[PDB]
Amino acid sequence: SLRMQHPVPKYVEVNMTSIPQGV
Amino acid sequence: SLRMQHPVPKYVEVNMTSIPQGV
Amino acid sequence: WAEAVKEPFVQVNPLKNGSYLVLASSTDCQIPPYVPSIVTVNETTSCFGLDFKRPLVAEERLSFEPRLPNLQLRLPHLVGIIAKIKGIKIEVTSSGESIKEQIERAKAELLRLDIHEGDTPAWIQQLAAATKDVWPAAASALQGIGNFLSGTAQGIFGTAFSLLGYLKPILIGVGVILLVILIFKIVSWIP
Amino acid sequence: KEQIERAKAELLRLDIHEGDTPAWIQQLAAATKDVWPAAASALQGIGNFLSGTAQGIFGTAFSLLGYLKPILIGVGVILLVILIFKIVSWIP
Amino acid sequence: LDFKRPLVAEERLSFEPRLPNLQLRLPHLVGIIAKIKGIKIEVTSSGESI
Amino acid sequence: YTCCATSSRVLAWIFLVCILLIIVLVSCFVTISRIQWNKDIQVLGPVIDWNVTQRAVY
Ligand SMILES: *[C@@H]1O[C@H](CO)[C@@H](O[C@@H]2O[C@H](CO)[C@@H](O[C@@H]3O[C@H](CO[C@H]4O[C@H](CO[C@H]5O[C@H](CO)[C@@H](O)[C@H](O)[C@@H]5O)[C@@H](O)[C@H](O[C@H]5O[C@H](CO)[C@@H](O)[C@H](O)[C@@H]5O[C@H]5O[C@H](CO)[C@@H](O)[C@H](O)[C@@H]5O)[C@@H]4O)[C@@H](O)[C@H](O[C@H]4O[C@H](CO)[C@@H](O)[C@H](O)[C@@H]4O)[C@@H]3O)[C@H](O)[C@H]2NC(C)=O)[C@H](O)[C@H]1NC(C)=O
Ligand SMILES: *[C@@H]1O[C@H](CO)[C@@H](O[C@@H]2O[C@H](CO)[C@@H](O[C@@H]3O[C@H](CO[C@H]4O[C@H](CO[C@H]5O[C@H](CO)[C@@H](O)[C@H](O)[C@@H]5O)[C@@H](O)[C@H](O[C@H]5O[C@H](CO)[C@@H](O)[C@H](O)[C@@H]5O[C@H]5O[C@H](CO)[C@@H](O)[C@H](O)[C@@H]5O)[C@@H]4O)[C@@H](O)[C@H](O[C@H]4O[C@H](CO)[C@@H](O)[C@H](O)[C@@H]4O)[C@@H]3O)[C@H](O)[C@H]2NC(C)=O)[C@H](O)[C@H]1NC(C)=O
Ligand SMILES: *[C@@H]1O[C@H](CO)[C@@H](O[C@@H]2O[C@H](CO)[C@@H](O[C@@H]3O[C@H](CO[C@H]4O[C@H](CO)[C@@H](O)[C@H](O[C@H]5O[C@H](CO)[C@@H](O)[C@H](O)[C@@H]5O)[C@@H]4O)[C@@H](O)[C@H](O[C@H]4O[C@H](CO)[C@@H](O)[C@H](O)[C@@H]4O)[C@@H]3O)[C@H](O)[C@H]2NC(C)=O)[C@H](O)[C@H]1NC(C)=O
Ligand SMILES: *[C@@H]1O[C@H](CO)[C@@H](O[C@@H]2O[C@H](CO)[C@@H](O[C@@H]3O[C@H](CO[C@H]4O[C@H](CO)[C@@H](O)[C@H](O[C@H]5O[C@H](CO)[C@@H](O)[C@H](O)[C@@H]5O)[C@@H]4O)[C@@H](O)[C@H](O[C@H]4O[C@H](CO)[C@@H](O)[C@H](O)[C@@H]4O)[C@@H]3O)[C@H](O)[C@H]2NC(C)=O)[C@H](O)[C@H]1NC(C)=O
Ligand SMILES: *[C@@H]1O[C@H](CO)[C@@H](O[C@@H]2O[C@H](CO)[C@@H](O[C@@H]3O[C@H](CO[C@H]4O[C@H](CO)[C@@H](O)[C@H](O)[C@@H]4O)[C@@H](O)[C@H](O)[C@@H]3O)[C@H](O)[C@H]2NC(C)=O)[C@H](O)[C@H]1NC(C)=O
Ligand SMILES: CCCCCCCCCCCCCCCCCCCC(=O)O[C@H](COC(=O)CCCCCCCCCCCCCC)COP(=O)(O)OCCN
Ligand SMILES: CCCCCCCCCCCCCCCCCCCC(=O)O[C@H](COC(=O)CCCCCCCCCCCCCC)COP(=O)(O)OCCN
Ligand SMILES: *[C@@H]1O[C@H](CO)[C@@H](O[C@@H]2O[C@H](CO)[C@@H](O)[C@H](O)[C@H]2NC(C)=O)[C@H](O)[C@H]1NC(C)=O
Ligand SMILES: *[C@@H]1O[C@H](CO)[C@@H](O[C@@H]2O[C@H](CO)[C@@H](O)[C@H](O)[C@H]2NC(C)=O)[C@H](O)[C@H]1NC(C)=O
Ligand SMILES: *[C@@H]1O[C@H](CO)[C@@H](O[C@@H]2O[C@H](CO)[C@@H](O)[C@H](O)[C@H]2NC(C)=O)[C@H](O)[C@H]1NC(C)=O
Ligand SMILES: CC(C)CCC[C@@H](C)[C@H]1CC[C@H]2[C@@H]3CC=C4C[C@@H](O)CC[C@]4(C)[C@H]3CC[C@]12C
Ligand SMILES: CC(C)CCC[C@@H](C)[C@H]1CC[C@H]2[C@@H]3CC=C4C[C@@H](O)CC[C@]4(C)[C@H]3CC[C@]12C
Structure with missing residues (x-):
């Protein structure tokens, strides 16, 4: 007997935008 | 603008057993 | 404005x-x-x-969002040390200041953070962090001579140098007394 | 008396430095102007000499000779220790 | 003054809070540190090392 | 005796040279560390422009 856990790929989309002058 | 792809964890269970003498 | x-x-x-x-x-x-x-x-x-x-999901309508102009801003090299030794939020430049005016602003203040007999190792470690981006070879050296006075033995060399630093006025005083003997003892050999 | 003994220690410890002598001398003048106008005009002159005359080469020279002070003493001491021995090794 | x-008052059921007690060690020369700044200045944290 | 007298002489010379070198090593360190600090103060500092795309790490 030998139980194991194999990792399987995935992903989450992350958009980012700027803030001119930090305002 | 800046589009990105962040990895997110997951897993698949995998059981294994033996074959005495290779028969 | 800058603040630590x-x-x-x-x-x-x-x-x-x-x-x-x-x-x-x-x-x-x-x-x-x-x-x-x-x-x-x-x-x-x-x-x-x-x-x-x-x-x-949202429905798109006519926008009235403002779009500000972009702006590059040059800060002083040691802005982190200037903000730290004030312990309050402090003014460091203007949007439209010259390289010369910006520098001649914390220079006198910064020069007078000089080396002392009582925290040479702690001073030398600041000089390294300040020098790292300019001259990485020198930083690694300074950092080494830092840890030698602090760590090697039980910091005995740090101790020794700290003490020899505070004694400076006594040593001169003695040194002067030796000369005044030597001169007389020499002059009282010549025929 | 109380008013004066309030920023005196603070103010005294804004002393002359090897790294901004010209910028210091120009403050001393502005501070002295109302007290002694003759001295101010002098100090202001010796200010502009270290800053302006040539390409400020004298400012540079003095700034550098200021930072070298510890090396010079060290050498000076080595000369005495030679001179004394060389002198004592002339007397019969 | x-x-x-x-x-004299009549006693009712209380809801007053009871905060935990706390020892606090200050620097030996705290008075000289506060004097040469001439503003209200941060001197330690509740849980800082010697 | 002569060896003991010679030893005392040689010891004193090495003891003198030992110090006169330490005087020169400390003196040189103070000069160089203080100049570098002066140069560190007058270097050009960082630039900030609020551009996110510029700071992306893959
Ligand atoms: C929640 O709310 C927030 C807001 O609080 C939402 O975030 C906002 O989302 C908006 C999307 O709806 C974003 O707008 C988009 O910005 C994009 C990037 O804009 C910049 O780059 C542009 C291109 O720059 C390159 O290319 C040009 C040549 O084409 C070169 O010159 C450059 O060098 C670059 O290489 C550029 O045009 C923009 O310039 C404008 O803005 C800056 C300041 O940010 C000014 O300095 C400029 O002067 C200029 O503004 C003036 O001129 C323009 C026209 O040129 C006018 O529109 C302005 O009114 C003003 O007069 C930026 O530098 C854009 O690409 C993108 O364009 C889309 O839409 C247009 C039509 O409007 C189409 O034609 C395009 O094809 C495209 O589809 C859009 O405008 C906001 O940035 C973002 N805000 C913030 C603060 O982050 C968020 O999404 C919301 N979230 C949710 C969940 O709803
Ligand atoms: C105007 O208003 C003000 C308020 O704004 C009024 O002032 C308040 O008046 C109150 C009286 O009504 C006072 O309350 C009384 O406090 C007494 C002292 O409490 C402290 O000491 C206690 C004993 O400590 C010793 O002994 C123990 C063993 O028994 C040892 O372990 C110790 O080392 C000491 O040797 C101690 O129990 C208390 O501890 C509690 O409070 C502190 C914080 O202050 C906490 O750190 C503790 O964890 C603890 O709080 C928790 O646990 C207790 C139970 O143990 C709970 O009750 C709490 O809710 C909480 O979970 C203090 O260190 C008390 O002796 C006195 O007890 C009387 O009442 C109880 C019943 O409640 C009886 O059983 C007793 O027999 C006794 O009659 C009472 O509580 C307020 O202190 C005071 N407030 C302030 C801020 O000063 C003022 O009077 C008003 N004026 C007018 C005119 O009306
Ligand atoms: C606001 O905007 C100003 C203007 O851009 C910024 O100040 C300028 O910063 C830049 C970039 O750091 C500096 O560029 C360097 O220029 C020198 C040559 O300078 C000489 O010639 C200039 C000709 O126009 C002249 O303006 C200068 O005058 C100033 O300086 C003198 C001397 O101190 C002073 O007396 C005057 O009163 C003026 O203050 C001066 O005569 C050049 O040698 C540099 O070359 C380097 O960089 C380039 C490009 O990477 C490289 O190719 C070279 O090899 C070398 O490494 C560099 O181009 C400019 O000097 C600054 N100008 C002023 C007026 O100060 C300021 O930083 C911005 N402020 C803020 C807060 O963001
Ligand atoms: C918050 O709470 C902390 C923890 O209590 C307070 O800090 C401590 O203060 C006490 C009281 O002033 C100090 O007690 C002394 O401890 C030394 C021995 O210290 C050595 O052994 C410790 C073993 O646990 C160890 O933690 C120490 O490590 C620290 O120090 C080293 C060296 O600088 C440093 O490298 C580490 O990173 C740690 O910072 C250390 O190895 C002991 O010699 C003292 O004895 C005196 O007092 C007793 C009792 O009166 C007396 O019997 C003796 O004769 C002698 O007079 C004393 O017990 C303790 O060292 C402090 N601990 C730390 C971690 O700093 C802190 O003050 C509180 N903060 C605030 C804001 O209130
Ligand atoms: C992060 O930014 C991304 C841009 O790089 C966003 O992707 C855009 O999201 C919109 C959502 O409305 C998509 O629009 C959909 O388009 C499909 C069909 O695609 C075709 O037509 C569209 C125009 O309608 C065109 O842009 C495409 O090129 C295709 O030709 C429709 O079925 C939907 O109903 C909807 O209209 C954009 O297609 C999409 N653009 C890109 C370049 O991928 C993304 O949503 C952002 N993510 C987050 C998390 O905010
Ligand atoms: C038990 C251990 C064994 C004993 C070891 C010691 C044996 C000594 C033998 C006898 C000789 C005595 C020598 C006398 C030394 C006196 C030190 C003087 C220190 C001193 O006054 O300097 C002041 C503080 O700096 C300081 O105090 C910093 C001093 C320098 C620290 C760095 C030392 C490491 C040097 C590394 C050398 C390699 C580097 C590359 C060359 C600043 O100077 P100022 O007072 O003029 O004021 C200038 C403006 N503030
Ligand atoms: C290429 C050009 C030609 C070369 C010219 C130079 C030739 C020199 C020839 C060899 C002789 C060398 C002389 C050694 C001088 C060393 C200077 C020491 C400076 C120094 O340590 O002073 C410190 C900073 O002041 C200073 O550094 C300020 C120094 C003075 C600046 C003003 C100079 C103008 C004088 C005007 C004279 C007329 C006025 C009226 C009499 C402060 O002193 P401290 O370290 O003891 O600390 C006291 C508490 N901070
Ligand atoms: C969020 O965006 C991610 C982008 O990583 C989407 O991932 C894709 O999912 C499909 C399945 O529909 C796969 O075939 C693609 O290979 C994935 N693309 C990648 C990894 O680039 C994901 O579907 C999106 N999620 C939602 C809920 O819309
Ligand atoms: C297959 O086995 C895996 C074991 O990795 C299961 O993964 C678990 O899934 C649940 C969601 O139902 C998560 O909350 C757990 O954290 C996961 N366990 C882990 C990672 O140990 C997975 O659900 C199984 N898949 C199927 C289809 O039954
Ligand atoms: C913000 O940063 C990005 C990345 O440095 C700049 O976009 C680049 O612009 C240059 C031309 O100047 C192009 O050659 C590159 O291909 C662009 N890179 C990317 C990833 O788009 C951008 O110009 C910067 N400034 C602004 C105002 O957006
Ligand atoms: C040890 C006995 C014989 C006394 C002899 C005097 C010697 C040790 C003393 C006299 C004056 C001293 C110098 C006085 C001032 C400085 C400047 C300081 O920044 C570095 C050390 C240095 C250069 C000292 C080194 C030690 C010194 C040369
Ligand atoms: C040039 C070679 C031969 C070395 C000779 C040593 C001479 C130049 C050195 C040794 C010690 C030095 C002095 C040490 C300290 C001070 C105090 C300072 O506030 C003014 C300069 C002054 C007065 C220095 C002038 C130059 C000096 C006299």
Whole structure:
């Protein structure tokens, strides 16, 4: 007997935008 | 603008057993 | 204005339209550090130890959002040391200041943080952190001579140098007494 | 008396430095102008000499000779220790 | 100024908070540090090392 | 005796040279560390422009 856990790929989309002058 | 792809964890269970003498 | 802050720094504001405003001293979920940004995700995930949810689809209307002009800003090289030794939020430049005026502003202040008999190792470690970006070879040397006075033995050399530093006035005094003997003893040999 | 003994220690410790002598001398003049106008005009002159005359080469020279002070003493001491021995090794 | 004797009151069920006690070690020369700044200045944290 | 007298002489010379070198090593360190600090103060500092795309890490 030998139980194991194999990792399987995935992903989450992350958009980012700027803030001119930090305002 | 800046589009990105962040990895997110997951897993698949995998059981294994033996074959005495290779028969 | 500049102001010293505690590390690690994390600030996350949930916006009403369903995005998040992030400013953080460290990376997470691919978000760059030190520069702020408006962040949106296509599927619920945990970032900076809290849940960033996917927003509800919206209908597009005519916008009235302002678009400010962009702006490059040059700061003094040692802005971190200037903000630290004030212990309050302090003015460091103007938007439209010259290289010359900007520098001649904390120079006298900064020059008078000189080496002392009582914290040479702690001083030498500041000089390294200040020199690292300019001359990396020198930094690594200074850092070494720092840890020698602090660490090697039980810091006995640090102790020895600290003490020989404070004795300077006594040593001169003795030195002068030796000359006054030597001169007389010499003159009282010549026929 | 109380008013004066209030920023005196603070103010005394804004002393002359090897690294901004010309910029210091120009403050001393502005501070002295109302008290002693003759001295101010002098100090202001010796200010502009270290800053302006040539390409400020004298400012440079004095700034550098200021930072070297510890090396010079060290050498000076080595000369005495030679001179004394060389002198004592002439006397019969 | 005059500290007056208060009027007798009737006892009701209380909701007053009781905060935890706390020892706090300050620097030996805290008075000289506060004097040469001439503003209200941060001197330690609750849970800082010697 | 002569060896003991010679030893005392040689010891004193090495003891003198020992100090006169330490005087020169400390003197040189103070001069160089203080100049570098002066140069550190007058270097050009960083630039900030609020551009996120510029700071992307893959
Ligand atoms: C929650 O709310 C927040 C807001 O609080 C939402 O975030 C906002 O989302 C908006 C999307 O709806 C974003 O707008 C988009 O910005 C994009 C990037 O804009 C910049 O780059 C542009 C291109 O630059 C390159 O290319 C040009 C040549 O084309 C070169 O010259 C450059 O060098 C670059 O290489 C550029 O045009 C923009 O410039 C404008 O803005 C800056 C300041 O930010 C000014 O300095 C500029 O002067 C200029 O503004 C003036 O001129 C423009 C026209 O040129 C006018 O529109 C302005 O009114 C003003 O007069 C930036 O530098 C854009 O690419 C993108 O364009 C789309 O839409 C247009 C039509 O409007 C189409 O034609 C395009 O094809 C494209 O589809 C759009 O405008 C906001 O940036 C963002 N705001 C913030 C603060 O982050 C968030 O999404 C919300 N979340 C949710 C969940 O709803
Ligand atoms: C105007 O208003 C003000 C308020 O704004 C009024 O002032 C308040 O008046 C109150 C009286 O009504 C005072 O309350 C009384 O406090 C007494 C002292 O409490 C302290 O000491 C206690 C004993 O400590 C010794 O002994 C123990 C062993 O028994 C040892 O372990 C110790 O080392 C000491 O040797 C101690 O129990 C108390 O500890 C509690 O409080 C502190 C913080 O102050 C906490 O750190 C503790 O954890 C603890 O709080 C928790 O645990 C207790 C139970 O143990 C709970 O009750 C709490 O809710 C909490 O969970 C203090 O260190 C008390 O002796 C006195 O007790 C009387 O009442 C109880 C019943 O409640 C009886 O059983 C007793 O027999 C006794 O009659 C009472 O509580 C307020 O202190 C005071 N407030 C302030 C801020 O000064 C003022 O009077 C008003 N004026 C007018 C005119 O009306
Ligand atoms: C606001 O905007 C100003 C203007 O851009 C910024 O100040 C300028 O910063 C830049 C970049 O750091 C400096 O560029 C360097 O210029 C020198 C040559 O300078 C000489 O010639 C200039 C000709 O126009 C002249 O303006 C200068 O005059 C100033 O300086 C003298 C001397 O101190 C002073 O007396 C005057 O009163 C003026 O203050 C001066 O005569 C050049 O040698 C540099 O070359 C380097 O960089 C280039 C490009 O990378 C490289 O190719 C070279 O090899 C070398 O490494 C560099 O181009 C400019 O001198 C600054 N100008 C002023 C007026 O100060 C300012 O930083 C901005 N402020 C803020 C807050 O953001
Ligand atoms: C918050 O709480 C902390 C923890 O209590 C307070 O800090 C402590 O203060 C006490 C009281 O002033 C100090 O007690 C002394 O301890 C030394 C021995 O210290 C050595 O051994 C410790 C073993 O646990 C160890 O933690 C120490 O490590 C620290 O120091 C080293 C060296 O600088 C440093 O490298 C480490 O990183 C740590 O910082 C250390 O190895 C002991 O010699 C003292 O004895 C005197 O007092 C007793 C009792 O009166 C007396 O019997 C003796 O004769 C002698 O007079 C004394 O017990 C303790 O060292 C402090 N601990 C730390 C971690 O700093 C702190 O003050 C509180 N803060 C605030 C703001 O209130
Ligand atoms: C992060 O930014 C991304 C841009 O790089 C966003 O992707 C865009 O999201 C919109 C959502 O409305 C998509 O629009 C959909 O388009 C499909 C069909 O695609 C075709 O037509 C569109 C125009 O309608 C065109 O842009 C495409 O090129 C295709 O030709 C429709 O079925 C939908 O109903 C909807 O109209 C954009 O297609 C998409 N653009 C790109 C370049 O991928 C993304 O949404 C952002 N993510 C987050 C988390 O905010
Ligand atoms: C038990 C251990 C064994 C004993 C070891 C010692 C044996 C010594 C033998 C006898 C000789 C005595 C020598 C006398 C030394 C006196 C030191 C003087 C220190 C001193 O006054 O300097 C002041 C503080 O700096 C300081 O005090 C910093 C001093 C320098 C620290 C760095 C030492 C490491 C040097 C590394 C050398 C290699 C580097 C590359 C060359 C600043 O000077 P100022 O008072 O003029 O004021 C200038 C403006 N503030
Ligand atoms: C290429 C050009 C030609 C070369 C010219 C130079 C030739 C020199 C020839 C060899 C002789 C060398 C002489 C050694 C001089 C060393 C200077 C020492 C400077 C120094 O240590 O002073 C410190 C800073 O002041 C300063 O550094 C300020 C120094 C004075 C500046 C003013 C000079 C103008 C004088 C005008 C004279 C007329 C006025 C009326 C009499 C402060 O002193 P401290 O370290 O003891 O600390 C006291 C508490 N901070
Ligand atoms: C969020 O965006 C990610 C982009 O990483 C999407 O991931 C894709 O999912 C499909 C399945 O529909 C896969 O076939 C693709 O290979 C994935 N693309 C990648 C990894 O680039 C994801 O589907 C989106 N999630 C939601 C809920 O819309
Ligand atoms: C196959 O087995 C894996 C074990 O890795 C299961 O993974 C768990 O899934 C649940 C969601 O139902 C998570 O909450 C757990 O954290 C996962 N366990 C882990 C990673 O140990 C998976 O659900 C199973 N898949 C199927 C289709 O039954
Ligand atoms: C913000 O940063 C990005 C990346 O440095 C700049 O975009 C680049 O612009 C140059 C031309 O100047 C192009 O050759 C690159 O291909 C662009 N890179 C990318 C990834 O788009 C951008 O110009 C910067 N400034 C602004 C105002 O957006
Ligand atoms: C040890 C007995 C014989 C006394 C002899 C005197 C010697 C040790 C003393 C006299 C004057 C001293 C010098 C006085 C001033 C300085 C400047 C300081 O920044 C570095 C050390 C240095 C250069 C000292 C080194 C030690 C010194 C040369
Ligand atoms: C040039 C060679 C031969 C070395 C000779 C040593 C001479 C130049 C050195 C040794 C010690 C030095 C002095 C040490 C200290 C001070 C105090 C300072 O506030 C003014 C300069 C002054 C007075 C220095 C002048 C130059 C000096 C006299």
